[PDB]
């Protein structure tokens, strides 16, 4: 059998017995075949519905208990066996099981002792009976329990970011049934940025919270903080969803969606105007975004007809998410909480944003059609259909009840997108996966991302360039090194994926679905320098981390034995020139121009050998994979030599060698040389323009301002005529016009 054999039988008996009671009375016999087809989240709901009509069947109840046993849910599995046993006493083997499971999970309660006594009298002196007697004894005493707790706490003091240890603390709390403390630590720990990124931790967070909701202690205590803990569950669901989609398989991700949607439906009823309501807002968006990402995962593997229909469906999901407004940040109790919530908002808009675009670039105003066709409530049922099995009740599912009203159907603006990215760099703890994804998403756009601003958001007060550039010791790491690094990581990643699909769209993959986009070497470096800078390294591992960083420094700076293809160096050079040439301050201009000249000075010897059609000495285990896809050709050499000579002149100008800079700039009639010529002619005029000074000099001073006007006009004249020149502008067109207005009013 398969999935089709069992889900096709749905229509077989659906067409033979359609009333709800007989439809639910077939649930056990529906569930009979899903247990065989390895479907346990589905088989569970099928049997559970038959139990809703046939609540007195000992077979069905046991079958669910045996299914909860495969799910390892002891509390749920035990209860199921109990019902089957109390209905039918002749089920001896279940009395053993109950006694067997009660002693394995927790002995603190006498209920485990009681069921063991009965199990003994049903199986006099069987081999298992003693085994259970020894198991019950095993559990430690009060002093023993306190002993374990102190170890974990003393261990958590110095290792608060350890996923496993914090999990054990929740398990120890749960073993003493002081669940309020379990969630309390769970809540105070959802502020930890590292734990929030741990799949296994978030899974523990989801359980310990649900257990508390149903726990007797939650009701007795009070109903005031009930909302507070409820917020964390939704947050946990969002994080858990992001992680499950990336690592886990198609089946597990879909299953998590149902728990998410159940929570949303159970939460919306309360409403209000507090943190919980605001959280529901932002989490609502995440749901669709992840649901869209989830949709695209299935279609990727599937056929083309399903792909378009699914991508169509996903486009709507991402759209719904993007539309959701920025959550009300002021409305939260604390600074940490509100900053977190906003961070996630930026992540939602950024991820969904790029996806919305990459899907809309496929066709012309493709977005408009998506809304005009599927914004209809018919789409809501087509979405629930593709995502879920229709058998589940469509009433308590948030997806089926949401009011999809007035979808903006407006593609995102790049400027808004940039500030979403920059604000969400810390969303996924700055994993090189996160940034390499963003960097690639911007690789197809006409506006470039503010990488230098990303790094400032991550490593604060890390100097742009280190004074002690002579050595490669990693105490001298600089935001330039990182900026130079990410550029290669993305330039490398793009080429690798380009090669992959050629053998077999690359932009269209969502962030969770795609696999590692960087080499484990690169990832190891970023994780090292990150742990080092943020001061979350290990005294023992300090020396190792430190050396791991040191190894790659000499390559990021193009020093001895750099594994750098000439194309990647050139890309670094120009990418830094234009990055620096647009900066306002001199400090930053100088630095970025300096590095750009540096890399240029390293390439030109290679280009000259390449200019005469010779061979480059290939590298030894390079840090940035070489590719013949972008190997430099003679057709482009003279251009680089020219573009480099500009970068030289620019630095000469910034240092003070104006005479040589102008002499060089004027030699090449380039749009960029105008903006430089103009910018430096304007400065010679403005300073001397109004102080008392020789009249003859004043005339010469005005003469420069006249040249400034002319060069700015040449820029705009050539700019308006041709689009290719508009892209060559070292600064925005409107910025060039802005100066001109002031230049002439002077």
């Amino acid at each position, epitope marked *: 059998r398969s999935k089709a054999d069992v889900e096709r039988y749905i229509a077989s008996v659906q067409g033979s017995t359609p009333s709800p009671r007989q439809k639910s009375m077939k649930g056990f016999y529906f569930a009979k075949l899903y247990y065989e087809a390895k479907e346990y989240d589905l088989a569970k709901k099928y049997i559970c519905t038959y139990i809703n009509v046939q609540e007195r069947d000992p077979k069905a109840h046991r079958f669910l208990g045996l299914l909860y046993e495969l799910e390892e849910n002891t509390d749920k599995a035990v209860e199921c066996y109990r019902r089957s046993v109390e209905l039918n006493p002749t089920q001896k083997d279940l009395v053993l099981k109950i006694a067997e499971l009660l002693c394995k999970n927790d002995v603190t309660d006498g209920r485990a002792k009681y069921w063991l006594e009965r199990a003994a009298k049903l199986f006099p002196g069987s081999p298992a009976i003693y085994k259970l007697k020894e198991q019950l004894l095993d559990c430690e005493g009060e002093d023993g329990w306190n002993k374990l707790f102190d170890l974990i706490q003393s261990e958590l003091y110095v290792r608060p970011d350890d996923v496993h240890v914090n999990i054990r603390l929740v398990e120890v709390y749960r073993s003493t049934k002081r669940l309020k403390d379990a969630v309390a630590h769970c809540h105070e720990a959802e502020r930890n940025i590292a734990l929030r990124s741990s799949l296994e931790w978030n899974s523990c967070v989801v359980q310990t919270l649900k257990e508390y909701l149903e726990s007797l202690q939650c009701l007795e205590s009070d109903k005031s903080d009930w909302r507070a803990t409820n917020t964390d569950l939704l947050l946990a669901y969002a994080n858990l969803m992001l992680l499950t989609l990336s690592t886990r398989d198609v089946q597990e991700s879909r299953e998590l969606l149902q728990s998410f949607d159940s929570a949303l439906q159970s939460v919306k009823s309360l409403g209000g105007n507090d943190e919980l309501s605001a959280t529901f807002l932002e989490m609502k968006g995440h749901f669709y975004m992840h649901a869209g990402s989830l949709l695209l995962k299935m279609g990727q593997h599937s056929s083309n007809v399903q792909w378009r229909a699914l991508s169509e469906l996903a486009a709507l999901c991402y759209l719904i998410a993007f539309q959701v407004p920025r959550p009300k940040i002021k409305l939260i109790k604390g600074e940490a909480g509100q900053n977190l919530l906003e961070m996630m908002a930026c992540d939602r808009l950024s991820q969904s944003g790029h996806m919305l675009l990459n899907l809309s670039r496929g066709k012309q105003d493709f977005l408009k059609e998506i809304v005009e066709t599927f914004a209809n409530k018919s789409g809501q049922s087509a979405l629930y259909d593709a995502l879920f099995s229709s058998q589940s009740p469509k009433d308590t599912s948030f997806l089926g009840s949401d009011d999809i009203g007035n979808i903006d159907v407006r593609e995102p603006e790049l400027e808004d997108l940039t500030r979403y990215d920059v604000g969400a760099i810390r969303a996924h703890n700055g994993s090189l996966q996160h940034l390499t994804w963003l960097g690639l998403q911007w690789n197809s756009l006409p506006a470039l991302p503010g990488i230098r601003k990303w790094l400032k958001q991550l*490593f604060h007060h890390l*100097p742009h360039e280190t004074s002690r550039l002579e050595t490669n010791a990693p105490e001298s790491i600089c935001i330039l090194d990182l900026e130079v690094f990410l550029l290669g990581v993305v330039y490398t990643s793009h080429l690798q994926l380009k090669e992959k699909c050629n053998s077999h769209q690359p932009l269209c993959l969502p962030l969770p679905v795609c696999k590692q986009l960087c080499t484990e070497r690169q990832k190891s470096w970023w994780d090292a320098v990150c742990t080092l800078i943020h001061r979350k390294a290990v005294p023992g591992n300090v020396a190792k981390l430190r050396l791991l960083v040191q190894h790659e420094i000499n390559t990021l700076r193009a020093q001895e034995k750099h594994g750098l293809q000439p194309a990647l160096l050139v890309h670094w050079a120009e990418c830094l020139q234009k990055t620096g040439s647009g900066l306002n301050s001199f400090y930053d201009q100088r630095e970025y121009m300096g590095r750009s000249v540096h890399y240029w000075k390293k390439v030109l010897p290679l280009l000259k050998i390449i200019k005469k059609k010779n061979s480059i000495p290939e590298p030894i285990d390079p840090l940035f994979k070489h590719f013949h896809s972008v190997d430099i050709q003679a057709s482009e050499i003279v251009e680089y030599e020219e573009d480099a000579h500009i970068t030289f002149a620019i630095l000469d100008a910034v240092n003070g060698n104006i005479e040589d800079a102008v002499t060089a700039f004027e030699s090449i009639k380039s749009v960029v040389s105008y903006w430089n010529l103009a910018l430096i002619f304007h400065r010679k005029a403005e300073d001397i323009e109004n102080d008392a000074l020789s009249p003859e000099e004043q005339e010469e001073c005005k003469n420069y301002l006249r040249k400034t006007r002319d060069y700015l006009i040449k820029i705009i004249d050539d700019s308006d005529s041709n689009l290719s020149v508009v892209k060559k502008l070292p600064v925005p067109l409107e910025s060039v016009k802005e100066m001109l207005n002031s230049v002439m009013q002077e």
Partner: antibody
Amino acid sequence: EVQLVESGGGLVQPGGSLRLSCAASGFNFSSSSIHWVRQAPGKGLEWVASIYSYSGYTSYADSVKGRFTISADTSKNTAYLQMNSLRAEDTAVYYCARSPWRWSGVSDGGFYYKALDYWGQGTLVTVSS
Amino acid sequence: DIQMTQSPSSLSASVGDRVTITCRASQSVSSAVAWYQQKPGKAPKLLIYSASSLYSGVPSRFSGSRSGTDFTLTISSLQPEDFATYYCQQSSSSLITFGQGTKVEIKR
């Protein structure tokens, strides 16, 4: 261009709490170990806390163990000395100082710092009801 | 616990003198000792690090030395600006301890 500035001092009642701030500039705060050294009037230097350079494992003198808490923030490029259950004996001038990773060695049984190069101006803390 | 016993507690000398201050480590300690100068009310400044290495910027008349478990600060030719209090400092495993200090008073 390189300096350490202490703040967050002032007087407080016994059994109260304070928080000192050691703001650093000019050296990469990540690779530096941060220390606090108090000095009562007419008395000598007493080491009270330390933070290993690249990770930040704490270590306190038994005279303040469990009451004080020293921390380091990379984003704010500043270290702090949280002080609780302050006693009249804690009345003293509190200095902070760094020891680079070049001078910070980890050994079996604990770590060692060769010396304290950069010191701060020193913020006064008075504890008296 | 390790202890750095500094001697003398208070010293009196005049300009040009060759002055000596000594600190004894109770347990056998490795060469991870330092020396500091603290003028009245101002901050302590580092003179010698790693027992006998001079901190950059310190005058050359300062020199550190060790003999067994006894560390010694030596000023070849005392100057008027060197009339201040001095301290010795050891760094053992996860612990730092200072000597009681030595005041250098002008003799008359």
